[PDB]
Design a protein around this nucleic acid. Structure first.
Ligand SMILES: [Mg+2]
Ligand SMILES: [Mg+2]
Length: 225
DNA sequence: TGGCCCGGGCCC
């Protein structure tokens, strides 16, 4: 029933780009939360209604990077992300170069395999967008052995199983489960910490869903190119 | 830009 066995490391991912898929967007900010599967299943059972926001696991590897793009941000993008191509170049931020791929490669190697990526609406944005950026580089994709899932498809499965329309956006799910508001929205590290929290709602059930719906990242159709 | 889900908004 398990195609790739039990995922030993769940790396939560969020991307910030210059615009929408029609804009041919480029990654402006990148964040990764490497969390071991035991660090997740150590999270205590959610008690009371509403249940409190679960604290992040103590043993966690974190990587947040700001990347200067090649094209300017869209009016809507720079508005919500708080990022701009002009300011990034001003602060000497480097492009999405091969040196960044090497950084990602070493960061991923320090994590036990098999490893799975978790992104909100990643199957249709974050994973295809990241797939394109790595394709631009002559350096081989460091994710040829890495797997990935969508937390939107996950949360939809966990909500219908617990409670036999409904908004499944990152902001909506977080508030619906904890009766609170996400801190620092539309920031790479701000959304992953939010993503981790809505994933720590029912960890055992989450890990159970991930191992079944885990698919190779090398099968994700690129956004463009 | 491609799939969801009661063909037009979801979901940077
Ligand atoms: Mg996202
Ligand atoms: Mg985001």
């Amino acid at each position: 029933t398990l195609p790739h066995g039990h995922m030993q490391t769940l790396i939560f991912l969020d991307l910030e780009a210059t615009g929408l898929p029609s804009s041919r967007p480029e990654v402006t900010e990148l964040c990764l939360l490497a969390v071991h599967r035991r660090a997740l299943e150590n999270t205590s059972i959610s008690q009371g209604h509403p249940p409190p926001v679960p604290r992040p696991p103590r043993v966690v590897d974190k990587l947040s990077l700001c990347i200067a793009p090649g094209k300017a941000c869209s009016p809507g993008a720079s508005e919500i992300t708080g990022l701009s191509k002009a300011e990034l170049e001003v602060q000497g931020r480097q492009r999405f170069d091969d040196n960044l791929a090497i950084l990602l490669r070493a960061f991923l190697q320090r994590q036990p395999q098999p490893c799975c990526l978790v992104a909100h609406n990643g199957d249709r944005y974050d994973f295809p967008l990241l797939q394109t950026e790595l394709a631009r580089l002559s350096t081989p994709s460091p994710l040829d052995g890495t797997f990935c899932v969508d937390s939107i498809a996950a949360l939809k499965a966990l909500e219908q199983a617990s409670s036999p329309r409904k908004s499944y956006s990152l902001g909506s799910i977080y508030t619906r489960l904890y009766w609170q508001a996400p801190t620092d929205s539309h920031t790479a590290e701000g959304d992953v910490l939010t993503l981790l929290s809505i994933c720590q709602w029912k960890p055992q059930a989450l890990l159970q869903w991930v191992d079944e719906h885990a698919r190779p990242f090398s099968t994700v159709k690129p956004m463009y190119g």
